[PDB]
Design a protein around this nucleic acid. Sequence first.
DNA 1: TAACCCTAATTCGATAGCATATGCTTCCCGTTGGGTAACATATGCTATTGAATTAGGGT
DNA 2: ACCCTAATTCAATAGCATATGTTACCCAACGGGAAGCATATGCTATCGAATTAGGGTTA
Lengths: 162, 176, 176, 161
Amino acid sequence: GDGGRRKKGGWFGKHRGQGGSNPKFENIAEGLRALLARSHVERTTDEGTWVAGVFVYGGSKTSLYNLRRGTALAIPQCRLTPLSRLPFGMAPGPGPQPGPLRESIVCYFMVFLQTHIFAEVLKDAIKDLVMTKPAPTCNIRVTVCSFDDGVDLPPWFPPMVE
Amino acid sequence: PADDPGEGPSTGPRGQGDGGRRKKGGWFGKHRGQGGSNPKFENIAEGLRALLARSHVERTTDEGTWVAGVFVYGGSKTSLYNLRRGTALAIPQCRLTPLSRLPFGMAPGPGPQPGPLRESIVCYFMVFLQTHIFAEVLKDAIKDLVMTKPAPTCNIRVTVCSFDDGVDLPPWFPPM
Amino acid sequence: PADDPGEGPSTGPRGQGDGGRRKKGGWFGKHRGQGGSNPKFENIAEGLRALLARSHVERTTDEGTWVAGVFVYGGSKTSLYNLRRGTALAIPQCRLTPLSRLPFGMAPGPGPQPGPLRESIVCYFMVFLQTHIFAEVLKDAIKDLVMTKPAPTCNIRVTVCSFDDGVDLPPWFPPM
Amino acid sequence: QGDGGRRKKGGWFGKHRGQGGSNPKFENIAEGLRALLARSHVERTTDEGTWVAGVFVYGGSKTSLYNLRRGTALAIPQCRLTPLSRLPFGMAPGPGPQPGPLRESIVCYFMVFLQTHIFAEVLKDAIKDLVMTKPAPTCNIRVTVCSFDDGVDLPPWFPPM
DNA sequence: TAACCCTAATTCGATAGCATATGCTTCCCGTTGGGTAACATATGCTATTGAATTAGGGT
DNA sequence: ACCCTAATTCAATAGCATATGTTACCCAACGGGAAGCATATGCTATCGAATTAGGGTTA
C-alpha cells in the first residue's frame, strides 16, 4: 500500500505545485545543491526578470518528477513548470510526417531562472546528478532556453492567506 | 443534430423541441496530438500565414532539428488553444505542445517569494521551429494579429525561444 | 422606438413588419466636411491607433505644411469611406479629401487607350499630413489593418503621396 | 432656352462624365498648353504602363480649373485626368483650435496622372505659365506635382466598346 | 504723341439644366471570435514498494 | 566466490486530485452592404465684362 502501507493511495491534498521535501527529493536536492555549490553564482536578478530557462526533458516521468521536486528544494530562488510531453519528432527517412499537434509520450519540465549564468550552472548540475543516476534517470536530458524578451512569470503571489 | 438545426423534435435555437440533447461529451475519437482543422482555426491560420507572407522566410531546416522555438503565453486558455490550432494549420512545418500553466513569478517587493514549485494560472504554449528566422517572423505575425484582435486576444503575449543544444524530439513512427 | 420606428419597418426585430418606414433613408443634419464619430469607424480607428502606436512618430509640424500625403485607392467605396472616417478619428492631425474616382489606366495591348477625362469606377481618398514620417507609419498601419480584414478592405491599396510645394489648404480663420 | 429667345442652355444635354469633346475654347487652352509643353519635349507615358507621377491642380475657380482640365485633356491624351474635388480645410490660424480632418473647403482641385515624372513637371510648368498669363481667376489656379512612390495603378483596362 | 474713346471682338467668368457620384446618417446581416457543458486525455501529490542492481565482504 | 543480506534509490503503483485535448453549440462583438438626403462635377451651350486691340483727332 502507500500512506498506510495498505491504502495504496487516496486524496492527500497537496494540490499541483504544493510540493514538499521528502527523503528521496531531499537527497536529490542535496546532490543538486552540492553540484550548484560547485559554481558560485547569483540566482535572483535585480530586475527579477526570468529571461533564462532550464528546459529538462527525456528520461522518465518518475525520474523527471523526482528531479523536479529535488530541483525545487535545491534551488528556492527559481521557478519550475509542471511536467509536459514533447510533440512527435519526424518520420524516419521517407514516410508520413506527424502533425505539429502530434505529441510524443516523452515528458519534460523547464526551470525558470532570472539569471542565464545560474541557469547554465543548474543545467550542468542536473546533467551531473542525472549522469550519476545508474537507474533509468541518466536518460533525462536538459537544454538552456534563453528568453530574449524574458518570460513574464506572474510577479504576484502575495500574502493572500489570511 | 445537436440542439441547433431548424425544426426537429429536439434542438432548441431553431424549430420545436425542448432540447437537452446538445454537445453531449462522448469522446470525439481524436486523441491528444491529433485534431481537425476547424473553420475558425484555419481562418486564424489564414491571417497568420497572411502576416507570415508579409515576411516570406524558410519554413524548415536541412538538419530538421527544432533547435529554435517560440513561447506563447498570457491571453486566455481558449484564445491560446485557438491560436495553437491555427498555428498548426498556418505552419505545418512546426511542432506544438499541449497548453501548460506557468509558475508564480517573484512575490512583489521583499514579500515572501512563492516557492520554486508554485504553478501560476497563466497558461503557456511552445512552437518548435527548425528555422530561427521564421520564428521571429511567426512571433511578429502573432503579435500583429493579437494586437489587431480584441483586448482578450491582445492579452496573449509571445516571445521567441532559443534552445542552447536544441530539443531532441523523439523520431516519429509512421503508423502501420 | 427611435431605433425601431414603425409597426413593420426596416428597423427593429422586424416583428409584424409589413416592409420599411423611416429606416435608413432621410436627410440628416450633416454636410460635406461635417461628420461625427461612429462606433464602426471608432473600432477601425482603435486598430489604426494601435498599429500607429507600434511606431510613435511626430504627427504635427511647426510649419504645419501639408507636404505629406497618402493614396488610399481600390477596395470598395463603403470600405474606403469607413477607413477614411476611422482615420479621421484615429488621426486628428490630418486632412481627408472627399472620396474621388480614379481614371482608367493604359489599355492592355494596342486596344484603344482610354482618354485622360475617362474616369474608372475605382474610388480613392487622399490624406494630408504635416510630416511624411507619420505618413509612412499611417500607410503601414492601414495596409496591415486591411490585410487582417478578409473583407474587400484587404483589396484597398495605399501608397504615401509627396507634395514638393505642399498643398496650401485654406486657413480655418472663418470660424469666429 | 438652350439657344433661341433666352438662348441659354437649359435641360439634359445627354452628355456624361469623361465625355469631353474638343471645345474650340478648350482646344485654344490646350493649344496654349501644347505650345508650352512643346518647349520641353518628354515622353508622356513609358512602356511600363505605370502611373507613378501625378499633377495635382487646385486654387483659382471651378470654371478656370475645368477649362484648364479640358485643355490639358485635349493637349495631352496620354495622361489621365481626375474629376474636380473640394480640398479640405487648412490649419486654423491664431490660438483658435484647428478644424476637423473631414472639414473640407470651397477650393476645388484635380490631379493629372502621368507615367513620366519629367513630363509631369513639364505639364506643371506649362500649366503655371498659362495660369500666370491668364489674369482671370485662372491665375489664382494653383498646381503641384503629386509624385507616387509606389505609383497609383490606374485601372489599366481597355475601355470596352 | 500719346493719350484718348469705344465699342465690339474675345476669351474665359459666370452663368443655365440634367443625371452620376459623395457625404452622414441610419438598419442590418454575414462574420469571427471567445466561451462554455462533456468524454477522453495529462500531470501534481503522497505514500509504499519491491526489485534488479549495486554491493558485500570476510568468510 | 559468493550467501544471504542489505539495500537502495528510485522508479514504479496506486487511489485521490487537478489540468488539458477535440468537438458540438450559443452568443458574442463588427464592417461591408444597403436608402435618402442635401451636397457637388462632367459636358455643353450661350452669354458677359474685364480685356484687347483698332484706329484715327490733333497737334
